[PDB]
Design a protein around this ligand. Structure first.
Ligand SMILES: *[C@@H](C(=O)O)[C@@H](O)C(=O)N[C@@H](Cc1ccccc1)C(=O)NCCCCCNC(C)=O
Length: 212
């Protein structure tokens, strides 16, 4: 795999979103991997509905948190609508998939990246955007305004984001905190420290959708 990967340069990443006060990071995370894999397989970049996962993933807890892998399983098992059809409202409501007509896109499954393995994560990122988790509670992460982020942070992972690239010394992460946070909504997190957890726990729990 190459020295640099940046899925934004391959037109596989949609604009940065703001999840708002809702604890829907898991849905935003899942969606950018779906947006990425649909573009990679079909050549079309579309935006898909975080709200639909928020509303419809019964194994997750709506705005109280949830699981990227659950959301990804639901798109593999059913599908997902365009964001425009099922826009983000920042609050869990009822699952309105049926009212929204046919699904816009559909994946074939979900894979886990071998945890605590930097190389496995990089290999996955070189293939497609990946849902990853990290500890975002620390003020250093929250006040991040740019640069390669080394912490400080623990491994109490609490926030799902999407890895959309990497370089020699960083993994490139799309956050869901709007374009004003970090580097126009992105953070570069240091890699290659030998910390098996990843910095801020980045290697704890990583998933990507499969699309044939
Ligand atoms: C995301 C956010 O919007 O900031 C956050 O609320 C969230 O969903 N965090 C998850 C991330 C995660 C997923 C899978 C493995 C590891 C981390 C989280 O920390 N836990 C998922 C369960 C929901 C959080 C706790 N909920 C309740 C009701 O206690």
């Amino acid at each position: 795999i190459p020295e640099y990967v940046d899925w934004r340069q391959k037109g596989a990443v949609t604009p940065v979103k703001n999840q708002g006060s809702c604890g829907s990071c898991w849905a935003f995370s899942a969606v950018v991997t779906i947006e990425g894999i649909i573009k990679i397989r079909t050549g079309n970049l579309n935006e898909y509905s975080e709200q639909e996962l928020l509303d419809c993933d019964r194994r997750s807890y709506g705005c109280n948190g949830g699981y990227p892998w659950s959301a990804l399983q639901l798109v593999a098992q059913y599908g997902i609508h365009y964001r425009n059809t099922y826009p983000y409202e920042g609050v869990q409501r009822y699952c309105r998939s049926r009212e929204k007509g046919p699904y816009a896109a559909k994946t074939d499954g979900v894979r886990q990246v071998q945890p605590y393995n930097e190389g496995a994560l990089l290999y996955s990122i070189a293939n497609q955007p990946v849902s990853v988790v990290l500890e975002a509670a620390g003020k250093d992460f929250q006040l991040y305004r740019g640069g390669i982020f080394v912490g400080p942070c623990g491994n109490k992972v609490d926030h799902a984001v999407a890895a959309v690239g990497y370089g020699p010394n960083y993994i490139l992460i799309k956050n869901s905190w709007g374009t004003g946070w970090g580097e126009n909504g992105y953070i570069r997190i240091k890699r290659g420290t030998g910390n098996s957890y990843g910095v801020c726990g980045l290697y704890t729990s990583s998933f990507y959708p499969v699309k044939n």
